[PDB]
UniProtKB/Swiss-Prot annotation, chain B:
This is Spike protein S1. Residues 40-47 are annotated as: Immunodominant HLA epitope recognized by the CD8+. Binds to host ACE2. RBD also interacts with the N-linked glycan on 'Asn-90' of ACE2. Cleavage of S generates a polybasic C-terminal sequence on S1 that binds to host Neuropilin-1 (NRP1) and Neuropilin-2 (NRP2) receptors. Interacts with host integrin alpha-5/beta-1 (ITGA5:ITGB1) and with ACE2 in complex with integrin alpha-5/beta-1 (ITGA5:ITGB1). May interact via cytoplasmic c-terminus with M protein. May interact (via N-terminus) with host bilirubin and biliverdin, thereby preventing antibody binding to the SARS-CoV-2 spike NTD via an allosteric mechanism. The gene is S. Changing Y45F: In strain: B.1.1.298. Changing K11N: In strain: Beta/B.1.351, Omicron/BA.1, Omicron/BA.2, Omicron/BA.2.12.1, Omicron/BA.2.75, Omicron/BA.4, Omicron/BA.5, Omicron/BQ.1.1, Omicron/XBB.1.5, Omicron/EG.5.1; May enhance affinity to human ACE2 receptor. Attaches the virion to the cell membrane by interacting with host receptor, initiating the infection. The major receptor is host ACE2. When S2/S2' has been cleaved, binding to the receptor triggers direct fusion at the cell membrane. When S2/S2' has not been cleaved, binding to the receptor results in internalization of the virus by endocytosis using host TFRC and GRM2 and leading to fusion of the virion membrane with the host endosomal membrane. Alternatively, may use NRP1/NRP2 and integrin as entry receptors.
C-alpha cells in the first residue's frame, strides 16, 4: 500500500470486530502518523488459535 | 463488553460511556437473553 489517505477511524469504530490489538502504536493515534510502507496479509483460520 | 475497560476504543467507549483512566472499582456483567428478548427495540445507543 502506498500513496493513500487512509481513515483508520471508520474501521475500528464503524465495524463489528472480535479482537483489535495494535502492538507498537495506539488505535487513537493512527490518524496522525505517516507510515512509509504498509503491508496487508489476509487468511482465514479457526478462532481457538 | 470489552469497551467497559479503562482506556478502549469503540462507539460505545467513544460516544456513549467512558471510564476514566485511573479507575477504582469493578465492572460486573452477566448474560440475560431471558428477559430482554421478545425482539425488544427500545434499547437505543448513540450512533
Amino acid at each position: 500500500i502506498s500513496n493513500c489517505v487512509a481513515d483508520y477511524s471508520v474501521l475500528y469504530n464503524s465495524a463489528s470486530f472480535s479482537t483489535f490489538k495494535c502492538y507498537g502504536v495506539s488505535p487513537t493515534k493512527l490518524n496522525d502518523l505517516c507510515f512509509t510502507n504498509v503491508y496487508a496479509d489476509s487468511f482465514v483460520i479457526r478462532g481457538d488459535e | 463488553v470489552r469497551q467497559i475497560a479503562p482506556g478502549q476504543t469503540g462507539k460505545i467507549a467513544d460516544y456513549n460511556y467512558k471510564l476514566p483512566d485511573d479507575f477504582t472499582g469493578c465492572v460486573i456483567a452477566w448474560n440475560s437473553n431471558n428477559l430482554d428478548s421478545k425482539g425488544n427495540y427500545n434499547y437505543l445507543y448513540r450512533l
